[PDB]
Amino acid sequence: LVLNCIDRLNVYTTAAHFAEYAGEEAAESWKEIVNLLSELLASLIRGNRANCALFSTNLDWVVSKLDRLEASSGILEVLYCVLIESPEVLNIIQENHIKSIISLLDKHGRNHKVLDVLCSLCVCNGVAVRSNQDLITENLLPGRE
Amino acid sequence: TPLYNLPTHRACNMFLESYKAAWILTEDHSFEDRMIDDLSKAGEQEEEEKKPDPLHQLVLHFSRTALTEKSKLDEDYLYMAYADIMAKSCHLEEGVEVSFEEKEMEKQRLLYQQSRLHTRGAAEMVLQMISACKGETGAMVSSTLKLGISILNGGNAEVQQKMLDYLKDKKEVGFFQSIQALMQTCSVLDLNAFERQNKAEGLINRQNGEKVMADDEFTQDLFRFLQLLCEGHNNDFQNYLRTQTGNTTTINIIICTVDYLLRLQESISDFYWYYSGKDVIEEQGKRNFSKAMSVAKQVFNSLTEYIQGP
Amino acid sequence: GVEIETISPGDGRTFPKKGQTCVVHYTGMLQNGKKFDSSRDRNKPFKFRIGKQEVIKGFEEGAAQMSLGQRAKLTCTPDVAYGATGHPGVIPPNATLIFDVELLNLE
Amino acid sequence: MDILELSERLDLQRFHSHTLRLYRAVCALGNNRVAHALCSHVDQAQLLHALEDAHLPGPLRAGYYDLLISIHLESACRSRRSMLSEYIVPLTPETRAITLFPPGRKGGNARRHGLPGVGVTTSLRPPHHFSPPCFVAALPAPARLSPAIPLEALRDKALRMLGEAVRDGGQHARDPVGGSVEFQFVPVLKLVSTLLVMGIFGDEDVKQILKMIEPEVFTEEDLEEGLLQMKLPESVKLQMCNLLEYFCDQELQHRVESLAAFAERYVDKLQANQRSRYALLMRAFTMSAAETARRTREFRSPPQEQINMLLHFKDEADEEDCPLPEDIRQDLQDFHQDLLAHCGIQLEEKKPQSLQELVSHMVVRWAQEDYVQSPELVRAMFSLLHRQYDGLGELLRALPRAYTISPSSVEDTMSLLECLGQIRSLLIVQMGPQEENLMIQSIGNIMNNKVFYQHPNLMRALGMHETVMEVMVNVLGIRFPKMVTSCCRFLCYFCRISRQNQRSMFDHLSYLLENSQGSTPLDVAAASVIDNNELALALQEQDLEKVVSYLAGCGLQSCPMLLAKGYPDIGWNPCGGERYLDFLRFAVFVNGESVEENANVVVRLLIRKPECFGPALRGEGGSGLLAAIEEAIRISEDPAVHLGHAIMSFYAALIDLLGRCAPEMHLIQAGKGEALRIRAILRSLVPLDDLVGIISLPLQIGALVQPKMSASFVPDHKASMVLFLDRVYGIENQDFLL
């Protein structure tokens, strides 16, 4: 239900571009409701291994919803919780997810939580995932920008 | 001449094994009581509100380890060694001369030894470990049942009161569930394995008599703990073992005890039926008969303790 | 290709020959001003042989035309060095290298 | 900007600290390629400068120290730590020269144990094999090594910094390095401990470290107070506990090595004495009654039984029962007393004079002073205290991992150890093609080693089979099919080396059977019980029931794997049935005889599930044995693995198993009504006419066109028929003609 609400609210890109369909009174509260939905989504799975394992199927949706400029603050926390609690979604992460995370770091400024997300990506619960390590090394280190 | 004319390394290895098996295994080691005495002294060359002597810190650490919620209890060698140390600090030191003075002095010494560590939360620790074992047998619960027996030796009213208060305060089902599971996993006299063991002994098996029962010591320890739970005619704990008002479910450990007794009686009857034809029972049959009768005696004593103190 | 220049003159008559160990002190950098590797920070010289390359082609060609201490600035273009495959965490795929090398080989 | 400017800029400091954390995490767990690549970003000079920077912020200082460690020393320290748990002391002359270093050492009066961690040791540990970093080399991965740093200069620098920090911590300065005592001591203590485990520090450096830790006790016989006498937080106390644990481990290893060194001399003396005794028995002693009691009771027992009773000299003082001269017993008792004195169980406000007393007093003082909150420090302190109080038990537990070898096999066992360490290092890496190839090559190199089949006890002590089984558990719980075949081949070869290896591998039979072309876990399970009467008798009923259920399932439902390739579609798969029946033939037939219980139970389970007998011997509508064989023959010459041969192979294997389960003749002739009941069940299962017809099938024999063995009838099928006929039916006068 929260996923459906977020999808319906996030169809419109901004709070003014085709977001006044409900009226000018609801334009200002759209961002607040989106942020509240993201925070509730983060809280519903924060620390619950079973919930994170069940929610891992929406990894592509979570990664795609990371470039909304208003939902990033909650979607990043959701992704971090999913990666920390259930370290099995690491194996099903391709290079495009890492590239999207690096693009988020480049576009949203120097954030210290993107680095934590990358660190969670690098190493599993005791086994080293060399694919993610090499992908991050090749996509981040050589360009000293 | 198989001893010499051999490579020196092979003889060295054999000598190492024999020497370790024959000489290094000293009995006393004179360290079980000394460690507990040293850890029980607080504020040495210094100094209530602050946490007292290291023994209580260690007990609290093990209680925290047991309290962490998880689906399985890991095998902790440190807990095994330290629980054995605490158990031997009381049981190994205090498990013709029937004078009142000597007997009462022994009783007071045992009471002081048990109070040295049951006032530091060991009674809670034993219950928490038994509950966290989830009814799975092993060396994790063998060292806990023995420690609980050592603390409860002689029928301590204070320890029984503390355990019952903890059980009635937590109101968490699972301790008696684990007890019931452990009782259900107890073995009986097996006739199918007896013939296989007889054939194996008549040409290694790496042991002797390790397939008939192989856990009679654990069964005796479990039933001794159950009996000592209500040794001093503890009416409250005798009622708790039957119906748990606070808990949402009742297990009725007494019925489990009588069921295991019935199973053991059936096994003994089958053994007698097998040995009816022969005139003289051989040594190996007598060993199994004695090792089953000891467990039967322990179960009978535990059943008596449920009734005495009407 | 190689675009060797001169920083400090050498001797001009002791060029390295085939089957010799060339000892050099080099500082590498991209064509951006960003240094990626140097040998002086490791406090040890770099030794390599001609005909047993074990180095990029541009470095070997640049070190070929030296004479006992001639500091040079070699410009190793693509398809002469690591090339399109590049180096993970090290030079990007399509980038040329500039080396500040000094042939201090003592034979 | 200056990196020291981050002290007041807290926004960039967090980002740089997490960047260093990312650098460590990317190259974590033996990723030496990324470790080599990171040297281009964080050079050696930068790390060395940051090590000595006294104005760096605490988080940045700790991050740089941990980055240097995780880049240059992590994998090698992990390998050395893994190897430190096992002792393999060769019989080299320096090992012989090694003494106990007891309280009564070379220079002493039975009072001083010496200094732990300094001396001579001979336990075999492979080197580190570092490689220099270079980004100008030509591009060519065969196990890339860690980047190389000068270890001597690093060790000297670390010692100098630790001494400077110890000296500066006594003055109670208001501006500690890194802003706190923890940020001043923990980053350098971690490096010191890592280099100590690496075995880089020399004897003089070890003595210097011991003096710095506690100069009152660790000196050679208000003034430079040691680390243990200062007021340190819990983070520094954890590192101190690790540092002391290293010295305790060194003392235990020294004790084990000294015990082996004494064992060499005692074995030599005992061999000489026994040779002299046998010479006396042979040349002399011709007047008694052959001395059969003094000969058959000592020189006829196995050498293991010739050494256990020979060690019953003392500990009772009244039961010798051994031909041991008194002086030899006195020497061994003197060594035993010295060993007991070393273990702190000697003597049948003073400052401590030994490591055990100092550690125990320090732990008790730490726990008494403050209520420790961090669980890790509490656990470490109590584990150290337990080890110090009880040393004899620690030696007893460490003894089974101790082994003695001749100096002529050191070169081979070093390669074997290196391969085992490669396996252990690869055990913590996500499964992949390059990793699979490397581990397969290492397993093959372990196989080809001559040590592997010469010291099976050493192989079992190292737990090699457990490591390889953990690898198989990881890969199985499909992907990487070649790896499981290599693993099962290694386990199968390991099982046949010795009886003890097979007994040890038998304990995992349930897991091996549950997870059931190349080698298979079923092959390992079969090889773990083959030709072992004691193991066969100990086999559990549920183990056979699982195989029976698998056989029923495979017989009832055909595997679609063969249907995927070009093959006719049928409702029953014979290949799986034959494979499952192969295992059961080893659990009922051992050394030519038959085990009664296993045969009875497998017969009962087989008859209670008729589907295991195939589509011919099931019941109503069955074609019969002759019809099934003829149908398979007819299938063999038309397109309709090569199907048709397996059809007869499955029936032949089933009949062979049924014949092998038949009761013995003397069982039948000596009553045993259950034997005749089983024989009657087998009799009614299949008639004599079927067997006689089966043996009567004809066979097929430019050059002559010989039919392919794998796509035609083979007399090996008739061999099962003949065996079954012999073992139940027999011939007296009737069938002996036709």
Quickly list DSSP for D129-154.
--B---SSSPP----PPPBP--HHHH
Distances from the Cα of B33 to the Cα of B88, B141, D509, angstroms: 8, 23, 43
Residues pairing with C46 in the sheet: C24
Rounded distance between C-alpha atoms, residue A97 and residue A82, angstroms: 14
B27 touches chain D (CB under 8 A): no
Which is catalytic among the residues C15, C46, C48, C56? C56
Burial of D599 per CB tally in 10 Å (0-12, 13-18, 19+): buried
- Burial of residue D625 (number of CB atoms within 10 Å: 0-12, 13-18, 19+): buried
D401-434 burial, b if ≥16 CB within 10 A, otherwise e?
ebbbbeeebeeebbebbbbbbbbebbeebbbeee
Contacts of D218 (CB under 8 A, 6+ apart): D115, D207, D210, D211
Q: How far is CA C58 from CA C12, C45, C63, C102, in A?
A: 21, 19, 8, 15
Distance from CA of D44 to the nearest CA of C (A): 6
Q: Tell me whether residue C37 is one of the annotated catalytic residues.
A: yes
Place of tokens 């070997």: C60
Using DSSP's 3-state secondary structure scheme, residue A145 falls into: coil
Q: With b meaning 16 or more CB within 10 Å and e meaning fewer, what string describes A75-107?
A: bbbbbbbbbbbbbebbeebeeebbeebbebbee
DSSP state, residue D1 = -
Contact D20, D63 (CB under 8 A): yes
Pick from A115, A119, A128: CB nearest D430: A128
Closest residue by Cα to residue B79 from D365, D246, D382? D382
- A90 contacts A124 by C-beta, under 8 angstroms: yes
Q: Which residues of B touch D259 (CB under 8 A)?
A: 16
| Cα end-to-end distance, chain D, whole Å | 106
Alpha-carbon distance D381 to D389, whole Å?
Answer: 12
Do D115 and D432 touch, CB atoms closer than 8 A?
Answer: no
Measured CA to CA, the distance from residue D339 to residue A96 in angstroms comes to 64
Does residue D439 contact residue D471 with C-beta atoms inside 8 Å? yes
Residues B122, B198 contacting (CB under 8 angstroms) = no
> Using a CB-CB distance cutoff of 8 angstroms, which residues of chain B are in contact with residue D386?
78, 81-82
- Say how far apart CA D648 and CA D574 lie, in whole Å: 8
Q: Is B104 annotated for ligand binding?
A: no
Closest by CA position to A136, among listed D147, D40, C89, D14: C89
CA-CA-CA-CA torsion for D383, D385, D390, D396, nearest 10 degrees? 30
Residue D480: CB atoms within 10 A of its CB come to 17
- On whether any CB of chain C is under 8 Å from the CB of D139, the answer is yes
Whether D265 has its CB under 8 Å from any CB of chain B: the answer is no
Residue type, D552: A
Name the residue facing D29 among A115, A128, A141 (closest C-beta).
Answer: A128
CA nearest neighbour of D586 among D644, D539, D632 = D539
Give the other-Cβ count within 10 Å of A33's Cβ: 13
Tokens of D309: 């009773």
| Residue count of chain B | 310
Nearest to B176 by CA among B247, B80, B82, B89: B247
- Residue B12: HSE in the Cβ half-sphere, 13 Å Cα cutoff: 25
State both tokens at B232. 């001093």
DSSP state of D452: T
Cβ-defined contact of C37 to D34 (cutoff 8 Å) = no
Give CA–CA dist B247/B240, Å, rounded: 10
> Rounded distance, CA D28 to CA A130, Å?
9
The count of C-alpha atoms lying within 13 angstroms of the C-alpha of A131, restricted to the half-sphere facing its C-beta, is 15
Chains B and A touch (3+ CB pairs under 8 A): no
Q: Do D405 and D442 touch, CB atoms closer than 8 A?
A: no
Class of domain C1-107: alpha beta
Min Cα–Cα distance to chain B from D18, Å: 30
Residue (of D616, D80, D110) closest to D342 by Cα position: D110
In degrees and rounded to multiples of 5, residue D554 shows phi and psi of -70, -35
Window 531-550 of D, Cβ < 8 Å to B? 534, 537-538
Residue C36 annotated in active site = yes
- What is the distance between the terminal CA atoms of chain B, rounded to a whole angstrom? 72
Under a CB-based contact definition with an 8 Å cutoff, are residues B33 and D412 in contact? no
What's the rounded Cα separation, in Å, for the pair B148 and B84? 11
Mark yes or no for CB contact A115/D428 under 8 Å: no
Those residues with Cβ within 8 angstroms of residue D109's Cβ, 6 or more apart along the chain or in another chain: none
Write out D629-689 in H/E/C secondary structure. Answer: HHHHHHHHCCCCCCCCHHHHHHHHHHHHHHHHCCCCHHHHHCCCHHHHHHHHHHHHHCCHH
Residue C81: CB partners within 8 Å, gap ≥ 6?
A: C56, C57, C58, C59, C91, C96, C97
* CA dist., res. A13 & res. D626, Å (int): 78
Is A133's CB within 8 Å of D27's CB? yes
Residue B27's closest CA among D382, D387, D315?
D315
Q: How many C-beta atoms lie closer than 10 Å to residue C45's C-beta?
A: 16
Integer angstrom CA distances of residue D536 from D543, D595, D715? 11, 8, 30
Angle between helices D673-685 and D596-608 (to 10 degrees): 40
Spatial CA neighbour of A131 closest among A105, A94, A101: A94
Task: List own/partner pairs for B297-303 with CB under 8 A and 24 or more apart.
Answer: B298/B219, B298/B220, B298/B223, B298/B224, B298/B227, B299/B223, B299/B257, B299/B260, B299/B261, B299/B264, B300/B261, B301/B223, B301/B227, B302/B223, B302/B224, B302/B226, B302/B227, B302/B257, B303/B254, B303/B257, B303/B258, B303/B261
Count H helices and E strands in chain B, helices first. Answer: 14, 0
Q: Is the Cβ–Cβ distance between C91 and C65 less than 8 Å?
A: no
Please give the C-alpha separations between residue B37 and each of B42, B116, D502, in angstroms, as whole numbers: 11, 9, 47
Closest CA to B30 of D350, D259, D347: D347
From the list C15, C36, C46, C48, the catalytic residue is C36
SS3 of D406, please? coil
- CA–CA dist D68, D649 (Å, integer): 64
- Asked if the C-beta of D473 comes within 8 angstroms of chain A's C-beta atoms, the answer is no
Candidates C4, C59, C91, C99; catalytic one:
C99
Q: How far apart are CA C102 and CA A111, in angstroms?
A: 42
Chain A CA closest to residue D19 = A115
Respond yes or no: is residue C48 known to be catalytic: no
Structure tokens at D338: 């010295």
Nearest to D137 among C42, C54, C99 (CB): C54
Q: Is residue D696 within 8 Å of residue D629, measured between CB atoms?
A: no
Cα D38 → chain centroid: 34
Cβ-nearest to D430 among A130, A137, A141: A130
Looking at the complex, report in whole angstroms how far the Cα of residue B199 sits from the nearest Cα belonging to chain D.
8
Segment 314-373 of chain D within 8 Å of chain B by CB: 315, 336, 340, 345, 360, 363-365, 367-372
Q: What is the DSSP letter of A123?
A: B
Q: Which two tokens stand for residue B67?
A: 């309290």
Contacts of D403 in chain B (CB under 8 A): 13
Q: Which of A91, A119, A127 sits opposite D429 (nearest CB)?
A: A127
The residues, any chain, with a CB within 8 Å of residue D84's CB and separated by 6 or more, are D125, D197, D249, D253
By CB neighbour count within 10 A (0-12 exposed, 13-18 middle, 19+ buried), where does D345 fall? middle
Q: Which helix (H) or strand (E) holds D405?
A: strand D402-405
Contact D227, D212 (CB under 8 A): yes
Residue D304 CA to residue A46 CA, distance in Å, equals 61
User: DSSP class of residue D727?
Assistant: I
Q: How far apart are CA B241 and CA B20, in angstroms?
A: 46
Task: Tell me: is residue B106 an annotated ligand-binding position.
Answer: no
Chain A nearest CA to C5, separation (Å) = 27
DSSP labels for chain C?
A: ------SB---SS----TT-EEEEEEEEEETTS-EEEESTTTTS-EEEETTS--S-HHHHHHHHS--SS-BEEEEE-TTSSSGGG--TTSS-SS--EEEEEEE----
CB atoms closer than 10 angstroms to residue B249: 9
Report how far residue C73's alpha carbon sits from residue C84's, in angstroms, rounded to the nearest whole number.
23
- How far apart are alpha carbons D487 and D698 in whole angstroms? 43
3-state secondary structure D232-294: CCHHHHHHHHHHHHHHHHHHHHHHHHHHHHHHHHHHHHHHHHHHHHHHHHHHCCCCCCCCHHH
Using CA atoms, how far apart are residues D486 and D514, in angstroms rounded to an integer?
19
Distance, in angstroms, between A4 CA and closest chain D CA?
35
Residues in chain D: 738
| β pairing state of D593-594 and D589-590 | antiparallel
Q: How far apart are alpha carbons D70 and C84 in whole angstroms?
A: 30
8 Å CB contact between C69 and C8: yes
Closest CA to D417 of D697, D674, D82: D82
**Given the residues C37, C46, C50, C98, the one annotated as active site:** C37
Start-to-end CA distance of chain C, whole Å, equals 27
Give dist(CA C99, CA C28) in Å, integer.
5
Task: Kindly state whether D437 is in contact with chain A, defined as any CB-CB distance less than 8 angstroms.
Answer: no
A141:C89 CB<8 A: yes
State the structure-solving technique: cryo-EM
Between A and D, how many residue pairs show a Cβ–Cβ distance under 8 A?
62
List of residues 6+ apart from B266 with CB closer than 8 A: B188
CB D624 within 8 A of CB D612: no
Q: Which of B107, B117, B103, B140 is nearest to B32 (CA)?
A: B117
Within 13 Å and on the Cβ side, how many CA atoms surround D364? 21
Active site residue C15: no
- For residues D254 and D394, give the distance between their C-alpha atoms in angstroms, rounded to a whole number: 13
Query: For residues B62 and B82, is the Cβ–Cβ distance under 8 A?
Result: yes
CB-CB under 8 Å, B42 with D345: no
Q: Which two tokens stand for residue C42?
A: 């490791």
C54 close contact with D: CB closer than 8 A: yes
At B144 the three-state DSSP class reads helix
Tell me if residue C50 is catalytic. Answer: no
Give the C-alpha distances (Å, rounded to integers) separating D119 from A53, C43, D214. 54, 33, 19
C79 is catalytic: no
Question: CA-CA distance, B88 to B82, in Å (whole number)?
Answer: 10
Measured in degrees and rounded to the nearest 5, phi and psi for residue C67 equal -150, 90
Grouping H, G, I as helix, E, B as strand and the rest as coil, residue D593 is: strand
Distance CA B210, CA B227 (A): 27
In this structure, what token pair is assigned to residue D488?
Answer: 């099962």
> Which residues does D17 contact at the CB level (< 8 Å), separation at least 6?
D59, D60, D63
Q: Which residue of A has its CA nearest to D15?
A: A112
The answer to whether the CB of D211 falls within 8 A of the CB of D165 is no
3-class DSSP state of D594: strand
Contact criterion met (CB below 8 Å) for D647 and D639: no
Q: Which helix (H) or strand (E) holds D590?
A: strand D589-590
Cross-strand partners of C23: C47
Using CB atoms, which residue from B18, B46, B200 is nearest to D311?
A: B18
Question: Which amino acid, one-letter code, is at D378?
Answer: V
Taking the C-alpha atoms of residue D706 and residue D468, their distance in angstroms, rounded to an integer, is 44
For residues C41 and D472, what is the distance between their CA atoms, to the nearest angstrom?
A: 46
Q: What is the dihedral of CA C26, C30, C31, C33, to 10 degrees?
A: -80
Residues of C within 8 A of D133 (CB-CB) are 42
Q: How far is D465 from D478, CA to CA, in rounded Å?
A: 22
Q: Which residues of A touch C88 (CB under 8 A)?
A: 134, 137-138, 141-142
- Residue D108's Cβ-count burial label (10 Å; 0-12, 13-18, 19+) is middle
- Give the 3-state secondary structure of residue B250: coil
**Chain centroid, CA D651 distance in Å:** 41
| CB count in 10 Å sphere of residue D393 | 18
Distances (CA, A) of D609 to D572, D614, D677: 15, 11, 18
